């Protein structure tokens, strides 16, 4: 997962070439991380060893 | 910088683009992630970057 961001600024260049860009961020700022269950990982990685 | 503090992984970059009419340039800004911007310079010019 990741945290909140405000919105996607809509900027038009020349003949209608709309593009989006990351604007401001509200409220606080955090990560940017992934979570994995340990006990499942442990025995799965061990079973890899036995085979 | 952000309304509640600052962020280290992004930069706020002032732009220099064309309007919808090919006669004028206008000021703009967007935020980008640090790893996608390179300081294209012949020296340590921290105010000149390129996508």
């Amino acid at each position, epitope marked *: 997962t990741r945290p909140n961001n405000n919105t996607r600024k809509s900027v038009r260049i020349g003949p209608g070439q709309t593009f989006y860009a990351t604007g401001d961020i509200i*409220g*606080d700022i955090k990560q940017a991380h992934c979570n994995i269950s340990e006990e499942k990982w442990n025995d799965t990685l061990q079973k890899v060893g036995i085979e | 910088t952000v309304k*509640t503090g600052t962020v280290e992984e992004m930069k706020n970059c002032s732009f220099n683009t064309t309007t919808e009419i090919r006669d004028k340039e206008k000021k703009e800004y967007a935020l980008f992630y640090k790893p996608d911007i390179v300081p294209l310079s012949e020296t340590n010019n921290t105010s000149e970057y390129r996508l």
Partner: antibody
Amino acid sequence: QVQLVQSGAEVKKPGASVKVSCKASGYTFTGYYMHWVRQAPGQGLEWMGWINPNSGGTNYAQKFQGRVTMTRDTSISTAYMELSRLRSDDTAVYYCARGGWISLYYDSSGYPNFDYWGQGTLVTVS
Amino acid sequence: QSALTQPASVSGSPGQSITISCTGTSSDVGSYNLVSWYQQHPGKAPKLMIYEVSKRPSGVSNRFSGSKSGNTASLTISGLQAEDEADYYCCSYAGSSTVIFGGGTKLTVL
């Protein structure tokens, strides 16, 4: 135990400013948010934003737009509010209250859990 | 973006169960579950009374309950005594790192 020691009451002229502080004790203040509220004698409770103790980032509520600033000092575990451009409408009672636990992995500031509050202080404008 | 609507005051005979309601816009309480109740005795700092309307905080006796539905929520107090003579406030998360506190309501005893 978790205590919040505030400063004494004060009265100032219109247009002046007053400094309000709140001191933490009994716990590691660097892991919890801190919010503020004002209450006039007969009105509701107006909420002002939190101040992060570590990075020092601050949020402010609407209807201030900079007339109030918030700062901190981690060496003595004390927060300070600077209330500028006082008017007669600012006559009220001020309190500090401790917020939720800061987790570094998700936004938790929006959890209005205030279990420990200071004794408060009176602010009057002449 | 105004405060939450609250009654002015409530009353009740000793023992009587009392229900207090708070009404807001779905953007506040219909969206999330971040709702809390506070009570404050005149001349004292407030005390927290409710977590997650239907969750009890620590240090609270088994006299307070509540629930939410749609755009409103309420608190129920059983076994009314003189000790419950206090002011009550609702407050909830607004989104955008903001919090709403309600107008409040005064409890009277008979």
